[PDB]
């Protein structure tokens, strides 16, 4: 099995956002600089096996990578990857709500879809994800599960 | 010997408690009066929150009395409490009887909490089973 | 090599048995014929008692075959068998098909019995989890 | 060290089940197909995965609450048992316990979680009466 | 958090019924004669984890401690506490039915309430709990579980 | 319980090993009118299953032809542990084996002269 070439663009963008060198990313995954190098350029395609290993190395769940790759196949690029800091802020709020609140734990379908939906509402409302507190997110999350 | 730390969100109900020495679970009370019409369901607060140790799981089983006598079951049985979870424990009741409504009274025992070790297995993808 | 003492309260039925070595369950059998109309339930005897060791729990599961093919389920699934329980294992069967009746006969496989360890934890109230850990 | 669970992907279009947080009892299973369940109807639903449950242990398929609470989506045989010898596809016997509202399950949706647990492979010893 | 003083009266009464000195209950619970006396009189209220330790020491499941309390909260006293010898005999049967008989184990709602009902019926037929055997209780016990 | 003597013996006679051959294993020796397992010679599940057919019909057709069975069971097992169609739809592998041998005999087809794929097709059919 071999993945499409846009995965290499996903790993490049997410290595640079997580502030890791090729060398640092190597030490974590086990891949040599050369491997990561070609992967990030499109000299080689990332093995289906390997994407799990990259996810653990970056410290990003593999299914996030997959959902970001699905955006590529559809829209030709990825709006989640281009605004990854915003998704990351909201996703940690969404994640904390799920583990601390009973109106969430027992009602969630998909943390990713809910993360994306809270983000879309804040944009409609012209509100930045850094200018709100957890208490505000929770009240808005409860709405979308209700 | 293991101690499950628990927070009583609802101070009006007693701490749940293992009734007999070797019993597998401890009943959880309803914190609310509910009526379930046939085939209809309800998420019901138990007035407690627990800290399942890392390497264990909380498991919400339905009570055999309510289920045979009256058809009261749990939709997501057995309900998984993850070790990470620190919210109020709730029970997804459902009336699986075709005609008689069930009435739950704040105070009623309406499920039992088990706690078990769980293999936090490492998934590793392979191409074909050589096993 | 842990031992589960079991009494054939009904000698006409086979002794529950582990089909293969790695298999989690032993099939229980109905002692009685039951017809369940759509939606209806019935508490059916299996004609066995068991001695679940202290520190353990017995678990009665529904079997995939009847579940997929005719909608046969257990209301209180999974059935919890306490280590102090020495009476007959009974199974709360419900028919979850909307139209077809289900007819269980004496001798049919109606459930898997699993035996697992359980944590016999003691419940201690804490002010808040923040103070006592996460 | 941790216990390995080997997993194959009979359908590579789906992402690999993953353990979101360190001590989460289960890993979510995704649906391999699109299905409409009318009220009280059921379906045996492929997940595009096979597993190698270690000998001594058992795969258990639990319902995701939320689907259970909000649309009454359950599992007929809950909790579904994977034996250590089974190497075929995990299929989930889903059912609609709501009486009015059809349920639509999209390929790629999270329809159940897989726990692995140790199971006592007990010796049955027949006896006349007890001690 | 503290239980409302009436647990003091409940433990003292049950300790006396259990033919226990403050020494025996002290050498079992870990509480000093001083703390047991301040619980039993009302000076100090019984914490929520203290009622669990008392139950174990007495040899009574805390659930009965909580249901006797509930009697007080409603009526102003506890008929069950007043007559706890009649109740202890019946409950030990009820307890033996449940753990040893299929008709009870799977059909039982509340061991506490079912022990109440079986007394009412022995009372209203002018029979003594001290007169009857396990088999008579069971017969009647199976009836009330329909 | 004497019926098992025929079973234990007939399994030996079929197993192509002398008394001495099995009489060296797990301890003529201590075999009189002759379950702990005959060194697990056959899974005790099957020995107890053949026993159960004595208490329903006077005889065991399964033991009467253990040759044909052992072949079919091994197939029915492969299908169970490897095919999603079989695992979720089976009711009892022993019974389902006996049913497949039944159908083959009336079609005048031999177990030893058949492949898995054929049996798997039939199997899927009897389960539907």
Author numbering:
A (entry chain FFF), E (entry chain EEE): 8 to 153
B (entry chain III): 2 to 132
C (entry chain HHH): 2 to 135
D (entry chain JJJ): 1 to 131
F (entry chain GGG): 11 to 37, 40 to 46, 60 to 153
What wording appears in the published article?
Stl, the master repressor of the Staphylococcus aureus pathogenicity islands (SaPIs), targets phage-encoded proteins to derepress and synchronize the SaPI and the helper phage life cycles. For all these Dut-StlN-ter complexes, the Dut maintains its trimeric state and binds three independent Stl monomers, each of which uses predominantly its middle domain to interact with individual active centers of trimeric Dut.
The mDut-StlN-ter complex was crystallized in the space group P21, and the crystal asymmetric unit contains two mDut trimers and six StlN-ter monomers, forming two mDut-StlN-ter complexes with a 1:1 stoichiometry in which each mDut trimer interacts with three independent StlN-ter protomers. In the mDut-StlN-ter structure, the two independent complexes are largely identical with a root mean square deviation (RMSD) of 1.1 Å for the superimposition of 642 Cα atoms corresponding to the Dut trimer and the three StlN-ter protomers. Interestingly, a detailed view of this structural comparison shows that the trimer of mDut in complex with Stl is more similar to the nucleotide-bound form than the apo form. The differences are mainly concentrated in the unique and short α helix (mDut residues 65 to 70) from the catalytic motif III. In the Apo mDut, this helix is distorted, losing its helical topology, whereas in the nucleotide- and Stl-bound forms it folds as identical α helices. In contrast, the absence of motif VI is exploited in the complex with mDut where Y116 presents, in the different Stl subunits, rotameric conformations alternative to that observed in the ϕ11Dut and hDut complexes. As in phage and human complexes, Y116 from some Stl protomers interacts with mDut D109 and R110, but in other protomers, the rotamer is identical to that observed in the Stl free form, losing these interactions and forming new ones with L67 and R70 in motif II.
